[PDB]
Amino acid sequence: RPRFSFSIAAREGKARTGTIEMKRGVIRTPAFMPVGTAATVKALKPETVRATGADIILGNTYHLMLRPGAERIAKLGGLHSFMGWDRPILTDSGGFQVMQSEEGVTFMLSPERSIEIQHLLGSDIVMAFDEVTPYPATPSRAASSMERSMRWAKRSRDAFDSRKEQAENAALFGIQQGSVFENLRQQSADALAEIGFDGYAVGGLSGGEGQDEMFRVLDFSVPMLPDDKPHYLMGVGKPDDIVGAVERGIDMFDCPTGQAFTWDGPINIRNARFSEDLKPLDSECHCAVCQKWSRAYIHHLIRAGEILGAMLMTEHNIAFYQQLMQKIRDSISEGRFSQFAQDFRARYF
Amino acid sequence: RPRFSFSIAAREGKARTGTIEMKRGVIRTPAFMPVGTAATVKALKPETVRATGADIILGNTYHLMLRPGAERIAKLGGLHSFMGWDRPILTDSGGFQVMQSEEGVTFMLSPERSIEIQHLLGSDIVMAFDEVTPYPATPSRAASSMERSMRWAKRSRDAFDSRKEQAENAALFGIQQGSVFENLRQQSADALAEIGFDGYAVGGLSGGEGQDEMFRVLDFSVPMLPDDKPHYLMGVGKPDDIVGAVERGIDMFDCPTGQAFTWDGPINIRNARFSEDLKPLDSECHCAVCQKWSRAYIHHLIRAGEILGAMLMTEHNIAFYQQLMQKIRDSISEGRFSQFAQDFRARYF
Numbered sequence: 001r002p003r004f005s006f007s008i009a010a011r012e013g014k015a016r017t018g019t020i021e022m023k024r025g026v027i028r029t030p031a032f033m034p035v036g037t038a039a040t041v042k043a044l045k046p047e048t049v050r051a052t053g054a055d056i057i058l059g060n061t062y063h064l065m066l067r068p069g070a071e072r073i074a075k076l077g078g079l080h081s082f083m084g085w086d087r088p089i090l091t092d093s094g095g096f097q098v099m100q101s102e103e104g105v106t107f108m109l110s111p112e113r114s115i116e117i118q119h120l121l122g123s124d125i126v127m128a129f130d131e132v133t134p135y136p137a138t139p140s141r142a143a144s145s146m147e148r149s150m151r152w153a154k155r156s157r158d159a160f161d162s163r164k165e166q167a168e169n170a171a172l173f174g175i176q177q178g179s180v181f182e183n184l185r186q187q188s189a190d191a192l193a194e195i196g197f198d199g200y201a202v203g204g205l206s207g208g209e210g211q212d213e214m215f216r217v218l219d220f221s222v223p224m225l226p227d228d229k230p231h232y233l234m235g236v237g238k239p240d241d242i243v244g245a246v247e248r249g250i251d252m253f254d255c256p257t258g259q260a261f262t263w264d265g266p267i268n269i270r271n272a273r274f275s276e277d278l279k280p281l282d283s284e285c286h287c288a289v290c291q292k293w294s295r296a297y298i299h300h301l302i303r304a305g306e307i308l309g310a311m312l313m314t315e316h317n318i319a320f321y322q323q324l325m326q327k328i329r330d331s332i333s334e335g336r337f338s339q340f341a342q343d344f345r346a347r348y349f
Numbered sequence: 350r351p352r353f354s355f356s357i358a359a360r361e362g363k364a365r366t367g368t369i370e371m372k373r374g375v376i377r378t379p380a381f382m383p384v385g386t387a388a389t390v391k392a393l394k395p396e397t398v399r400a401t402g403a404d405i406i407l408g409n410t411y412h413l414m415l416r417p418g419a420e421r422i423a424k425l426g427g428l429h430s431f432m433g434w435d436r437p438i439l440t441d442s443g444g445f446q447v448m449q450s451e452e453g454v455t456f457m458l459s460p461e462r463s464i465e466i467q468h469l470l471g472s473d474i475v476m477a478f479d480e481v482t483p484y485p486a487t488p489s490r491a492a493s494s495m496e497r498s499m500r501w502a503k504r505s506r507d508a509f510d511s512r513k514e515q516a517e518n519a520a521l522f523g524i525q526q527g528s529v530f531e532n533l534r535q536q537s538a539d540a541l542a543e544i545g546f547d548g549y550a551v552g553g554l555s556g557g558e559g560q561d562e563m564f565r566v567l568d569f570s571v572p573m574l575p576d577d578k579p580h581y582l583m584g585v586g587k588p589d590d591i592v593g594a595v596e597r598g599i600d601m602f603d604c605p606t607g608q609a610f611t612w613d614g615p616i617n618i619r620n621a622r623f624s625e626d627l628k629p630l631d632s633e634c635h636c637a638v639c640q641k642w643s644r645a646y647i648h649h650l651i652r653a654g655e656i657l658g659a660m661l662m663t664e665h666n667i668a669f670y671q672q673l674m675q676k677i678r679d680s681i682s683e684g685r686f687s688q689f690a691q692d693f694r695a696r697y698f
């Protein structure tokens with residue numbers, strides 16, 4: 001297996017489906033990444049995460065760097081070994097969760113330390129360290145913040161490249177900034193392209209703007225990124241946000257872990273209407289949870305504060321997301337994604 | 350399969366090993382029963398409980414009767430169906446957890462209502478409803494309380510018998526009382542024998558008396574019970590308590606769910622000495638947890654308050670108990686239990 005190979009198998013409009021091949025495994029795209037925060041995907045063993053169909057998980061850096069510590073995890077063999085997940089892991093840069101000088105942020109985290117921490121963890125996909133642009137942001141501030149991010153993007157590239165085992169075995173993604181402003185998004189895309197990355201994230205969205213504005217920014221922002229590399233929309237996860245985002249060119253997502261997702265829309269299982277409902281969470285869902293337990297039981301578990309309630313709810317929700325991703329991939333491959341998208345939200349809402 | 354058949358396969362001194370056959374499955378004895386409190390064994394799916402080797406679980410009645418409600422559980426198909434465990438379930442009578450007139454206790458729970466609630470749950474082994482004798486207790490009070498329990502024992506027998514589906518499909522155990530007093534224990538055994546039960550519990554112990562006194566009471570108390578029926582020691586669960594209890598004639602236990610059990614004694618995984626320990630919880634343990642994760646990881650999980658920490662700790666501890674039970678059964682079968690018991694506690698302490 002190569003360090004990194006993204007291949008597009010099929011397209012429909014702006015949507016793409018394909019694969020990212022890496023040394024630890026193949027990632028099917030468009031891809032949803034369950035999040036692990038303190039080296040665990042909440043309430044699930046790694047084997048359960050895999051069984052839902054996840055190909056890659058996201059590891060939060062901020063928490064790991066505080067506990068148990070990046071050096072400690074490296075001493076113990078790296079994050080994959082520590083937590084028992086042997087497939088790819090994408091690590092975030094740690095900054096969002098902190099988030100201040102040109103060198104970085106003390107709360108000490110800088111482009112270089114971030115990349116070092118991700119190396120210590122043994123991350124497969126490394127995120128460049130950026131500066132959080134708050135929403136809303138004035139043009140001047142978004143610009144200043146975007147420029148700083150591009151300087152930090154270059155520092156991230158050079159830090160990554162200066163570490164041979166990292167350079168040979170991991171991938172590096174850059175993050176586009178610029179708030180909602182087209183010209184800033186363009187300058188940002190151009191800067192990142194000039195530096196060169198294995199993949200490109202759209203940062204700065206899903207922060208109060210609302211879906212309409214997010215989609216509008218995506219409309220012009222994703223075509224600015226290199227077409228031949230993956231496009232990652234950071235911190236976007238509602239099912240309808242994902243479908244629309246894929247319609248605009250996005251290949252990767254992270255964010256499911258009383259709310260249960262269903263094809264007819266989210267339900268809150270604690271609601272009294274489910275107390276004697278023997279149906280599964282979702283009548284079409286293939287997950288082991290819907291195979292074996294009723295709404296009534298999970299309703300009881302969650303109302304009683306039982307851990308098994310969290311376990312079941314999480315497994316269902318992550319499986320639901322992976323099934324969504326699978327339906328998206330198949331429909332693009334089959335050239336019926338536009339219809340899928342229409343059908344999905346006629347029923348979802 | 351018969352409603353109930355206890356067969357003793359081997360003996361060594363007072364210790365016995367055998368089987369209880371019931372319609373939902375075979376219970377290997379001596380047996381350890383994981384406890385389910387609100388229709389779940391904490392942090393484990395039923396399939397995981399089974400994988401540890403449990404043959405039967407205990408369901409707490411008190412909690413179920415409050416939430417979600419016994420009638421509701423019956424409406425939904427019974428406890429086995431509700432929670433996804435299809436093997437035998439022993440239910441307690443609900444009284445300990447409440448615990449006042451001759452009719453019962455309002456907090457309304459009486460012999461008859463208790464037996465009814467256990468029927469609604471679809472319990473396989475039904476516990477007679479008794480009166481809690483506190484420890485310590487004067488002779489007069491233990492006697493009064495024991496007498497009341499024997500009256501309630503007869504009421505429990507007749508309530509159970511008056512319900513054909515229960516009588517034909519479930520078993521009924523009586524509970525011996527009498528605190529630490531031999532003559533009261535004898536009167537109690539005699540009363541219960543005269544009424545007749547499928548099994549006999551030793552109630553009233555493990556309540557401050559300490560292991561030495563408990564063993565001393567067991568010394569004279571268990572031989573008073575019918576030899577040919579199972580002997581259940583209620584609410585006794587430390588590994589060393591179990592070994593000593595089996596040496597005295599006990600066949601069933603309930604009580605494992607930061608403390609991890611090991612063959613060298615309990616450890617508290619949160620202790621800083623384990624933060625970089627890559628060994629499993631126990632180096633001889635066969636459980637899936639010790640197959641895959643280190644002390645260091647579980648230490649981190651528990652210190653971080655992660656649910657996966659509780660999941661792993663619980664699975665290990667219950668597996669450890671089932672392995673203990675298996676070692677006990679094999680050593681009795683092989684006539685080397687006395688040596689096993691000696692070896693166990695030379696290392697355990």
Ligand SMILES: Nc1nc2[nH]cc(CN[C@H]3C=C[C@H](O)[C@@H]3O)c2c(=O)[nH]1
Binds near residue numbers: 092093134202206
């Ligand atoms: N580091 C990184 N991580 C991330 N997670 C989610 C987002 C998208 N950001 C938006 C979410 C909150 C902030 O106010 C910003 O408006 C992102 C990013 O832009 N960069």
Ligand SMILES: Nc1nc2[nH]cc(CN[C@H]3C=C[C@H](O)[C@@H]3O)c2c(=O)[nH]1
Binds near residue numbers: 583
């Ligand atoms: N109902 C029933 N459940 C039970 N769980 C544990 C015990 C053994 N009891 C002792 C534990 C607490 C009390 O002070 C009593 O000293 C038991 C019982 O004797 N009866």
Ligand SMILES: [Zn+2]
Binds near residue numbers: 290291316
């Ligand atoms: Zn499901």
Ligand SMILES: [Zn+2]
Binds near residue numbers: 638639669
């Ligand atoms: Zn173990």
